């Protein structure tokens, strides 16, 4: 892939692999979310980050995901080439945003889009803090200065408040544990794995009759390597909608909440 | 990727992705096993099929009996790896797929893999192997003279693997596949079992050693709604004996051996 002409965004093409497709013979939202994070990483490599700056590294500060929002119009087939464009933007002192457009290489049509909110956190104390002027400046030079939004709509689903699922849940999947393959290079659970855990409580019948269009996921707390998760789902609704909760099987400490929206095949 | 000049093998290049790397910023053996599989499918697509077909008239499928991988160096994140794969007939016993992994820049051999496949009914199992009439169809796509990723007469890839006896030195219990672990036909993909075997390796071995060899026998499939126990015992370089069995009745799904070199 490559930065575009103006060096304010980055583009990469992926051929969908045999093991990346699910029950519809098209790419899983989990495969998609992995490609988003792959292109995100190549963008950061391309402008000399490692997504820490010099200042962040000095202060032991990291970016962490607060929210991910994916909307898929068409999942690419096995052997299809998908093109992904990604860019970042400062949201003043609150944090940063990374956005994504997925396109069919042949038709040039938008088959998906995604957006995500990052907040700055001390690596060691795990304490959140607003973005400091020095940090704001260092990456303002790699971002469009006029607003560029994957989700521009006046009241767009990407920014809606998600409520807490009350017990009892309609559906549950109990005793979920990450294996080593769920870990990134720094021994942290991959953000994508939590997508897998949320969807594990979706009943088979929905998987058989519907396709996932939208997923919104808040990240509250990270699941450690030796934590166990419970995944909870309740129907909230031609379109089916669900409310989602991931919590630790013991004390019921919340790690995630979400909504998914499915349309009849 | 493409069939080589002679149409008797297939070649493809992969850029190692960020999420594909483990604890030492090099590709997991699970990423690798997924690449061997992808290149296998692309080879099958190219010669007109990863399920060799027109035999399916009688509802028969190829099924993995044994996977054997040896890695000399795991590619780093951003590296380009070239994989070449071919298939061979072992008479009426079954069928062999072999792989060579190269560093794209140096042309150096960084790994090799081999696997035994057998014919199964599918609606029934009954592993009835054999061919005669079925072989001709897919023998025009294979080298006629033997071509072996592991040619050395009496090599690791053909060793008899014994059954771990209780109690295990190490165990990881209550392993369950998720939807991400299923192929398009809702079967657990054979790479997941590699993951479940390595889950019972102690952290301290992961910290000090690198996996060099893995041999895995596939006895029975794990269903979507089965639960697995992974058992490991040190048999010594460090060596391990491995057993996957169903949590409940302790029905064997897999056995294997791993060999690790000091870092
Ligand atoms: N994870 C998945 C992988 C394939 C698929 F068809 C469905 C799902 C799901 O979670 O509903
Ligand atoms: N699955 C793994 C991923 C990374 C790693 F460094 C080790 C393992 C293992 O199984 O021992």
DSSP string, A169-217: PSEEEEEE---GGGB-TTSPBPTTHHHHHHHTTS-HHHHHHEEEEEEEE
- State the CATH number of the domain containing residue A217: 3.10.129.10
- Domain identity same for A28 and A144: yes
Are the CB atoms for B234 and B240 separated by under 8 Å?
yes
- Domain identity same for A136 and A201: no
Residue A178, domain member (yes or no):
yes
Rounded-to-integer distance, Cα B23 and Cα B212, Å: 15
Ligand 2 pocket test, pick from A178, A179, A181 with the greatest ligand atom count within 8 Å of Cβ, gives A181
Q: Pick the residue from chain B with its C-alpha nearest to A34.
A: B19
Residue A161, domain member (yes or no):
no
Best probe of the A interface among B39, B77, B184, B193, by most A CBs < 10 A, is: B184
Task: Name the interface residues of B facing A (CB cutoff 8 Å).
Answer: 17-19, 21-23, 25, 28, 30, 34, 37-38, 41-42, 45, 50, 77-78, 174-176, 178-180, 182-184, 186, 189, 191, 195-196, 198-199, 206
- Domain identity same for A104 and A193: no
Residue B106, domain member (yes or no):
yes
- Cis bond before residue A37 (omega within 30° of 0): no
Ligand closest to CA A211: 1
Q: What residues line ligand 2, using a CB cutoff of 6 Å? A: A 180-181; B 22-23, 28, 30, 198, 201, 206
Are the CB atoms for B254 and B194 separated by under 8 Å?
no
Q: Which atom of ligand 1 is nearest to the CA of A23?
A: 6
Query: How many A-B residue pairs are in contact by the CB < 8 A criterion?
Result: 74
Q: Catalytic residue, from B34, B142, B155, B187: name it.
A: B187
Secondary structure of residue B213 in the 3-state scheme = strand
Answer whether A199 contacts ligand 1 (Cβ < 6 A): yes
Are the CB atoms for B32 and B111 separated by under 8 Å?
yes
- Domain identity same for A20 and A76: yes
Q: What angle do CA B175, B237, B263 make, to 5 degrees?
A: 85
**What's the gap in Å between B220 CA and the centre of ligand 1?**
24
Residue B94 zone, left/alpha/beta (φ > 0; ψ -120 to 50; rest) = left
Gaps after residue numbers in chain B (C–N over 2.5 angstroms) = 49, 236
Q: Pick the residue from chain A with its C-alpha nearest to B177.
A: A176
Active site residue A223: yes
Residue B21, domain member (yes or no):
yes
Query: What are the respective helix, strand and coil percentages of chain A, to the nearest 5?
Result: 20, 40, 40
Residue B29, domain member (yes or no):
yes
**What's the gap in Å between B70 CA and the centre of ligand 2?**
15
Closest-CA distance of chain A to residue B129, Å? 26
Q: What residues make up the domain containing B37?
A: 2-155
- Domain identity same for B151 and B206: no
- Domain identity same for A65 and A126: yes
CA nearest ligand 1 atom 4, residue? A22
Rounded-to-integer distance, Cα A54 and Cα A40, Å: 19
Domain end among A131, A155, A179:
A155
Contact at CB, B174 and A179, closer than 8 angstroms: no
Of B217, B194, B193, B204, nearest in space to B169 by CA? B204
Are the CB atoms for B176 and B247 separated by under 8 Å?
no
- Domain identity same for B100 and B8: yes
Structural resolution in Å: 1.8
Q: Pick the residue from chain A with its C-alpha nearest to B43.
A: A18
**What's the gap in Å between B22 CA and the centre of ligand 2?**
6
Are the CB atoms for B230 and B85 separated by under 8 Å?
no
Residue B11, domain member (yes or no):
yes
The torsion of the CA quartet A15, A16, A20, A24, rounded to 10 degrees, works out to 180
Domain end among B155, B186, B201:
B155
Residues of B in contact with A25 (CB under 8 A): 184
Rounded-to-integer distance, Cα A221 and Cα A77, Å: 34
Among A79, A180, A197, beta carbon nearest to B198: A180
> Which residues, listed in sequence order, are joined to residue B178 by a DSSP beta bridge?
none
- Domain identity same for A99 and A192: no
- Domain identity same for A95 and A180: no
Domain end among A155, A185, A206:
A155
- Domain identity same for A144 and A35: yes
Of B14, B5, B33, nearest in space to B78 by CA? B14
Residue A37, domain member (yes or no):
yes
Are the CB atoms for B114 and B76 separated by under 8 Å?
no
Q: Which residue has the tokens 């202060």?
A: A59
Residue B178, domain member (yes or no):
yes
Are the CB atoms for B197 and B243 separated by under 8 Å?
no
Q: Pick the residue from chain B with its C-alpha nearest to A33.
A: B19
Rounded-to-integer distance, Cα B66 and Cα B143, Å: 21
Number of domains in chain A: 2
- Domain identity same for A196 and A97: no
Of B39, B59, B65, nearest in space to B50 by CA? B39
Helix axis angle, B190-198 relative to B29-46, nearest 10°? 170
Of B222, B253, B230, nearest in space to B174 by CA? B230
Ligand closest to CA B22: 2
Rounded-to-integer distance, Cα B231 and Cα B22, Å: 22
């Amino acid at each position: 892939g490559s930065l575009t002409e103006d060096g304010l965004s980055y583009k990469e093409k992926f051929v969908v692999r045999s093991y990346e497709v699910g029950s519809n013979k098209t790419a899983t939202v989990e495969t998609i979310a992995n490609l988003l994070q792959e292109v995100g990483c190549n963008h950061a490599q391309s402008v000399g980050f490692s997504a820490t700056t010099t200042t962040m590294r000095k202060l032991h500060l990291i970016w962490v995901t607060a929210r991910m929002h994916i909307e898929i119009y068409k999942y690419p087939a096995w052997g299809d080439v998908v093109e992904i464009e990604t860019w970042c933007q400062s949201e003043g002192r609150i944090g940063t945003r990374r956005d994504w457009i997925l396109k069919d290489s042949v038709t040039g049509e938008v088959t998906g889009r995604a957006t995500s909110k990052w907040v700055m956190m001390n690596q060691d104390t795990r304490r959140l803090q607003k973005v400091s002027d020095d940090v704001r400046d260092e990456y303002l030079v790699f971002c469009p200065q006029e607003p560029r939004l994957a989700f521009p709509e006046e009241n767009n689903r990407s920014l809606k408040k998600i409520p807490k699922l009350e017990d009892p849940a309609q559906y549950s999947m109990i005793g979920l544990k990450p294996r080593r393959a769920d870990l990134d290079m720094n021994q942290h659970v991959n953000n994508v794995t939590y997508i897998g855990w949320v969807l594990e409580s979706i009943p088979q019948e929905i998987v058989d009759t519907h396709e996932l269009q939208v997923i919104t996921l808040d990240y509250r707390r990270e699941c450690q390597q030796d934590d166990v998760v419970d995944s909870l789902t309740t129907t909230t609704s031609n379109d089916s909608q669900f409310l989602h909760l991931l919590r630790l099987s013991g004390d019921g400490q919340e790690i995630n909440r979400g909504t998914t929206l499915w349309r009849k095949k």
